Amino acid sequence: TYSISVETGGYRQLDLFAERCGEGNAVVTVADGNGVAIAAHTMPIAERRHHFSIAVPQKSTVTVAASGLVVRFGYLSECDDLLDNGVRYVNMNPSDTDWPAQPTLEQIYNRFGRSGAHFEPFARWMNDPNGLCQFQGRYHLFFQLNPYGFGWDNMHWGHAVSRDLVHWTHLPVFLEPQPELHTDERIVGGAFSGSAVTVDEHDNPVAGNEANAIRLYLTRHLETRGDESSVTEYQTTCLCEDGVHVRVESPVALRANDDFGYDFRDPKVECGMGGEALDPDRAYMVTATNLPVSEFGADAADSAVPGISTQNTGGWFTYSPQGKPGVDQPNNATVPAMTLFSAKKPLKRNVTWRYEGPVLADFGHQIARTYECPDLFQVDGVTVAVGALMHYRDKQGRFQQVRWYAGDLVNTDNGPKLDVKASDWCDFGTGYYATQSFADDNGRRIVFGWFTDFPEMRVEQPCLANGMMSLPRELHVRDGRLYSKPVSEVYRELLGERLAVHGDGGDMVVTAPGNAYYANVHLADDADAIMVLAKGVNPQDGRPTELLLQRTDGVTRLVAKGTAVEDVDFDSGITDVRQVEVFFDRNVVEVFLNGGQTAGSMLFQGADGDGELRIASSGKIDAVDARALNGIWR
């Protein structure tokens, strides 16, 4: 019997995510200050995990008791003005011993292994960002979540809200796995990734500040463990009417035919596009899947036909981040495709979604298994598609990179097709994954990404989360190519005091307090140069690690010496780098070159305490602007 004490304050509800640990009755009870019973709840017999929501009295110290189960995640909720106050974490996990029952934000986040300025959950696992939108004056961030462990599991939707895209207020868990996933151990799945459309009370898409509800479109996943051919993915919709709670969910789009790949997920609904190829009275949805190559011309790998991207980054197929080339064989019959659907507005829950064909197929990377997390939007007069390539490493060794494709949406006999004029990677590092974008009330195109641990910098331990989001980036298309740069709010909120630059015999040195800093470096030429960004230790074998930006014979690349991805060529992909902008936040780096011509980022655990930035060039350094980086919790 595990027991904790909790002060409720202004909160009215106690949420506990419990796992059955014993054989018989699994019970949670609440008692008042004198031991008088307040509540008694029993986990349903058939369930091995259950989310409890227990009414608790305000302004009271209550005792929470568990028997036959173990809590992995908890919080107080249902206070006044939940959107502004948020939930307060409750620690009933016997493994999280470094935390009291109600740890402060300082106690939750100010720990070695955590970032200081990137979004992370209280603890447990998080991946893809979902449901990005501006709604009634606030930015809403949903995310794939597993509250029961450190790895991926049956998928929930976490939820956080913000007024500046920098500081986040935690909200209650939004969506949860299908109930049968906790009564049938043979299956796995849950509420997979999804997007958001702000609508009025009649489901007409409107600007977020004028909206009455958020409409979400997401993937439900059902899979029999050990049988790929059992994967059942479909698209559903639901409303958030008050900014916090979800309402009824119902399906909207199934695989159009048996030639769709079983992988068919991550719907992204875009309402603000135009041009001759689209119906202005219809909203458009891209989904990630694969299609038989027989649905395309025999010359698809080198053709001029619209809807096909042909650039081949010369990599190989492998289902593991470390897999070497030639071991396993790809699906030679399929090609990753973005299947397009449209529905007549208003987007009432019962309007049908018409299959429009594949708007994009990546024949240059046809050995990749399938797409993940697609997106289709228009910015600065150019249509852009963004998607991730499963089970593919590029020539440089980067696993499951996210690719952007820019061009003109053209009208064809077989539906809308993206005439690709250019393509490249969104991020020349590794682990920047699962991108989703949205348009705020002023038309800014803003993208979030999830940093997955391909560098193997995360180690399972208590009082820690596995997963963080990138800093929000603004997107533009300049000369037919995608640019990305942190939004103005990131600069406004996170850039702290200037840091002195002192000389060490040709080296420029900046001491970084708390190993969190920003640096803006201007180079005068294309000469060889080196920037030591951070040092640390390989968390698996204890080897010294070193993080560099280094230019050699015109090629600029990130270098992660001593890490598991030391053998990967993080080529920036551009020439004539003159501006280097660096955000290093304790255990993650994000680098922007030439004002966003290319961006590169990855996880890298720097040493605890103070850091150091070291700059040297065989040419001339024009200027160095280094500043301490603020935190978003304290």
Side-chain angles (χ1 to χ4, degrees), residues 514-529:
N515 212 349
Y517 66 93
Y518 158 91
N520 183 12
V521 183
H522 284 285
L523 303 170
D525 45 60
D526 209 64
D528 282 5

PDB file of all heavy atoms in Angstrom, residues 514-529:
ATOM      1  N   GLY A 514      25.483  28.070 -16.918  1.00  0.00           N
ATOM      2  CA  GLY A 514      24.485  27.022 -16.999  1.00  0.00           C
ATOM      3  C   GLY A 514      24.479  26.239 -18.291  1.00  0.00           C
ATOM      4  O   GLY A 514      23.535  25.479 -18.530  1.00  0.00           O
ATOM      5  N   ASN A 515      25.505  26.406 -19.129  1.00  0.00           N
ATOM      6  CA  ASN A 515      25.623  25.715 -20.417  1.00  0.00           C
ATOM      7  C   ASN A 515      24.389  25.929 -21.291  1.00  0.00           C
ATOM      8  O   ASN A 515      23.931  25.019 -21.986  1.00  0.00           O
ATOM      9  CB  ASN A 515      25.901  24.223 -20.228  1.00  0.00           C
ATOM     10  CG  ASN A 515      26.763  23.654 -21.337  1.00  0.00           C
ATOM     11  OD1 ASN A 515      26.989  24.312 -22.354  1.00  0.00           O
ATOM     12  ND2 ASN A 515      27.253  22.431 -21.148  1.00  0.00           N
ATOM     13  N   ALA A 516      23.850  27.146 -21.261  1.00  0.00           N
ATOM     14  CA  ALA A 516      22.729  27.528 -22.112  1.00  0.00           C
ATOM     15  C   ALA A 516      23.005  28.925 -22.639  1.00  0.00           C
ATOM     16  O   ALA A 516      23.049  29.881 -21.860  1.00  0.00           O
ATOM     17  CB  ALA A 516      21.404  27.488 -21.344  1.00  0.00           C
ATOM     18  N   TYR A 517      23.192  29.048 -23.952  1.00  0.00           N
ATOM     19  CA  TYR A 517      23.614  30.317 -24.527  1.00  0.00           C
ATOM     20  C   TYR A 517      23.086  30.459 -25.947  1.00  0.00           C
ATOM     21  O   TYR A 517      22.614  29.501 -26.565  1.00  0.00           O
ATOM     22  CB  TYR A 517      25.142  30.449 -24.524  1.00  0.00           C
ATOM     23  CG  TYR A 517      25.850  29.451 -25.418  1.00  0.00           C
ATOM     24  CD1 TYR A 517      26.170  29.770 -26.734  1.00  0.00           C
ATOM     25  CD2 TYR A 517      26.200  28.193 -24.946  1.00  0.00           C
ATOM     26  CE1 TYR A 517      26.816  28.863 -27.552  1.00  0.00           C
ATOM     27  CE2 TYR A 517      26.852  27.279 -25.756  1.00  0.00           C
ATOM     28  CZ  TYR A 517      27.157  27.619 -27.058  1.00  0.00           C
ATOM     29  OH  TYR A 517      27.802  26.713 -27.868  1.00  0.00           O
ATOM     30  N   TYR A 518      23.192  31.681 -26.458  1.00  0.00           N
ATOM     31  CA  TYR A 518      22.922  32.013 -27.848  1.00  0.00           C
ATOM     32  C   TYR A 518      24.166  32.673 -28.425  1.00  0.00           C
ATOM     33  O   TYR A 518      24.849  33.432 -27.730  1.00  0.00           O
ATOM     34  CB  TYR A 518      21.702  32.944 -27.956  1.00  0.00           C
ATOM     35  CG  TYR A 518      21.633  33.771 -29.223  1.00  0.00           C
ATOM     36  CD1 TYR A 518      20.962  33.299 -30.342  1.00  0.00           C
ATOM     37  CD2 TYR A 518      22.223  35.028 -29.294  1.00  0.00           C
ATOM     38  CE1 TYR A 518      20.889  34.050 -31.497  1.00  0.00           C
ATOM     39  CE2 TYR A 518      22.158  35.784 -30.448  1.00  0.00           C
ATOM     40  CZ  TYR A 518      21.490  35.289 -31.547  1.00  0.00           C
ATOM     41  OH  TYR A 518      21.421  36.037 -32.699  1.00  0.00           O
ATOM     42  N   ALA A 519      24.470  32.388 -29.690  1.00  0.00           N
ATOM     43  CA  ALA A 519      25.631  32.995 -30.332  1.00  0.00           C
ATOM     44  C   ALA A 519      25.309  33.369 -31.770  1.00  0.00           C
ATOM     45  O   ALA A 519      24.736  32.566 -32.513  1.00  0.00           O
ATOM     46  CB  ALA A 519      26.840  32.057 -30.294  1.00  0.00           C
ATOM     47  N   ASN A 520      25.687  34.587 -32.155  1.00  0.00           N
ATOM     48  CA  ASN A 520      25.556  35.084 -33.522  1.00  0.00           C
ATOM     49  C   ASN A 520      26.950  35.461 -34.009  1.00  0.00           C
ATOM     50  O   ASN A 520      27.539  36.432 -33.523  1.00  0.00           O
ATOM     51  CB  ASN A 520      24.603  36.279 -33.583  1.00  0.00           C
ATOM     52  CG  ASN A 520      24.386  36.786 -34.997  1.00  0.00           C
ATOM     53  OD1 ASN A 520      24.769  36.136 -35.969  1.00  0.00           O
ATOM     54  ND2 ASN A 520      23.764  37.954 -35.118  1.00  0.00           N
ATOM     55  N   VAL A 521      27.478  34.694 -34.960  1.00  0.00           N
ATOM     56  CA  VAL A 521      28.841  34.862 -35.452  1.00  0.00           C
ATOM     57  C   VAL A 521      28.788  35.243 -36.925  1.00  0.00           C
ATOM     58  O   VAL A 521      28.065  34.615 -37.709  1.00  0.00           O
ATOM     59  CB  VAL A 521      29.677  33.584 -35.250  1.00  0.00           C
ATOM     60  CG1 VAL A 521      31.116  33.807 -35.704  1.00  0.00           C
ATOM     61  CG2 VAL A 521      29.630  33.145 -33.796  1.00  0.00           C
ATOM     62  N   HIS A 522      29.559  36.262 -37.299  1.00  0.00           N
ATOM     63  CA  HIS A 522      29.648  36.737 -38.675  1.00  0.00           C
ATOM     64  C   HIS A 522      31.046  36.461 -39.209  1.00  0.00           C
ATOM     65  O   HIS A 522      32.034  36.966 -38.664  1.00  0.00           O
ATOM     66  CB  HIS A 522      29.327  38.228 -38.763  1.00  0.00           C
ATOM     67  CG  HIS A 522      27.869  38.535 -38.647  1.00  0.00           C
ATOM     68  ND1 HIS A 522      26.979  38.315 -39.676  1.00  0.00           N
ATOM     69  CD2 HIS A 522      27.142  39.034 -37.620  1.00  0.00           C
ATOM     70  CE1 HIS A 522      25.766  38.671 -39.290  1.00  0.00           C
ATOM     71  NE2 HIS A 522      25.838  39.110 -38.046  1.00  0.00           N
ATOM     72  N   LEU A 523      31.124  35.670 -40.275  1.00  0.00           N
ATOM     73  CA  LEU A 523      32.386  35.329 -40.915  1.00  0.00           C
ATOM     74  C   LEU A 523      32.569  36.171 -42.170  1.00  0.00           C
ATOM     75  O   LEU A 523      31.601  36.467 -42.879  1.00  0.00           O
ATOM     76  CB  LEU A 523      32.434  33.840 -41.267  1.00  0.00           C
ATOM     77  CG  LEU A 523      32.229  32.876 -40.096  1.00  0.00           C
ATOM     78  CD1 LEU A 523      32.042  31.455 -40.597  1.00  0.00           C
ATOM     79  CD2 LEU A 523      33.394  32.952 -39.121  1.00  0.00           C
ATOM     80  N   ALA A 524      33.816  36.551 -42.442  1.00  0.00           N
ATOM     81  CA  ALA A 524      34.134  37.451 -43.542  1.00  0.00           C
ATOM     82  C   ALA A 524      34.520  36.731 -44.827  1.00  0.00           C
ATOM     83  O   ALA A 524      34.673  37.390 -45.861  1.00  0.00           O
ATOM     84  CB  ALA A 524      35.274  38.394 -43.138  1.00  0.00           C
ATOM     85  N   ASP A 525      34.678  35.413 -44.797  1.00  0.00           N
ATOM     86  CA  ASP A 525      35.215  34.689 -45.942  1.00  0.00           C
ATOM     87  C   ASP A 525      34.746  33.241 -45.873  1.00  0.00           C
ATOM     88  O   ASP A 525      33.917  32.875 -45.033  1.00  0.00           O
ATOM     89  CB  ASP A 525      36.742  34.791 -45.970  1.00  0.00           C
ATOM     90  CG  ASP A 525      37.360  34.555 -44.608  1.00  0.00           C
ATOM     91  OD1 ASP A 525      37.160  33.455 -44.048  1.00  0.00           O
ATOM     92  OD2 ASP A 525      38.038  35.471 -44.096  1.00  0.00           O
ATOM     93  N   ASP A 526      35.293  32.409 -46.760  1.00  0.00           N
ATOM     94  CA  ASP A 526      34.951  30.996 -46.838  1.00  0.00           C
ATOM     95  C   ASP A 526      36.077  30.100 -46.332  1.00  0.00           C
ATOM     96  O   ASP A 526      36.146  28.925 -46.705  1.00  0.00           O
ATOM     97  CB  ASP A 526      34.584  30.626 -48.275  1.00  0.00           C
ATOM     98  CG  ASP A 526      33.595  29.485 -48.345  1.00  0.00           C
ATOM     99  OD1 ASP A 526      32.455  29.665 -47.869  1.00  0.00           O
ATOM    100  OD2 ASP A 526      33.959  28.409 -48.869  1.00  0.00           O
ATOM    101  N   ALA A 527      36.954  30.632 -45.484  1.00  0.00           N
ATOM    102  CA  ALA A 527      38.123  29.897 -45.032  1.00  0.00           C
ATOM    103  C   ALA A 527      37.734  28.825 -44.014  1.00  0.00           C
ATOM    104  O   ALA A 527      36.633  28.824 -43.454  1.00  0.00           O
ATOM    105  CB  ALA A 527      39.151  30.851 -44.427  1.00  0.00           C
ATOM    106  N   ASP A 528      38.666  27.901 -43.781  1.00  0.00           N
ATOM    107  CA  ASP A 528      38.461  26.853 -42.790  1.00  0.00           C
ATOM    108  C   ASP A 528      38.240  27.464 -41.412  1.00  0.00           C
ATOM    109  O   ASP A 528      38.907  28.429 -41.029  1.00  0.00           O
ATOM    110  CB  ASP A 528      39.665  25.911 -42.758  1.00  0.00           C
ATOM    111  CG  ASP A 528      39.669  24.928 -43.912  1.00  0.00           C
ATOM    112  OD1 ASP A 528      38.784  25.033 -44.786  1.00  0.00           O
ATOM    113  OD2 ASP A 528      40.563  24.055 -43.949  1.00  0.00           O
ATOM    114  N   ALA A 529      37.297  26.896 -40.665  1.00  0.00           N
ATOM    115  CA  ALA A 529      36.951  27.428 -39.356  1.00  0.00           C
ATOM    116  C   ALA A 529      36.386  26.315 -38.490  1.00  0.00           C
ATOM    117  O   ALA A 529      35.915  25.289 -38.989  1.00  0.00           O
ATOM    118  CB  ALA A 529      35.947  28.581 -39.466  1.00  0.00           C
TER     119      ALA A 529
END
